[PDB]
Design a protein around this nucleic acid. Structure first.
Ligand SMILES: [Ca+2]
Length: 78
DNA sequence: GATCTGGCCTGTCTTACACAGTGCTACAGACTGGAACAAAAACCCTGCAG
């Protein structure tokens, strides 16, 4: 399987689709491969009704808050 | 010692006050796949405009 292998064999196996995404992203988005594979990951996770992992991902990619503002904290407290 | 009466009893009537909050669970409410749609957003592109 692809998930247990090292990065050498993973990239060796996937280089075809890696350069496919490379050329398609330089075609459409103008030098943005990272956001292209991000939108691909989001669509592949939402098609399977696993919205939770997509929400965690979006909370990692410039996520609003690791920690909370003291205000809403006091709110929850009371 | 009757008489009448101020006042007291009792019965009834009216407005008030604690009865949350806690686990279970079912339901409706939200999310998607192809087809296909219309309706606007904003540049570009042209005209009819002086
Ligand atoms: Ca009351």
């Amino acid at each position: 399987h692809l998930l247990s292998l090292t990065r050498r064999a993973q990239k060796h196996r996937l280089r075809d689709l890696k350069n496919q995404v490379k050329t398609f992203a330089e075609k459409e988005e103008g030098g943005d491969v990272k956001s292209v594979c991000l939108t691909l990951f989001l669509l592949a996770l939402r098609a399977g009704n696993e919205h939770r992992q997509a929400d965690e991902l979006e909370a990692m990619m410039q996520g609003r808050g690791f920690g909370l503002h003291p205000a809403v904290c006091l709110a929850i407290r009371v």
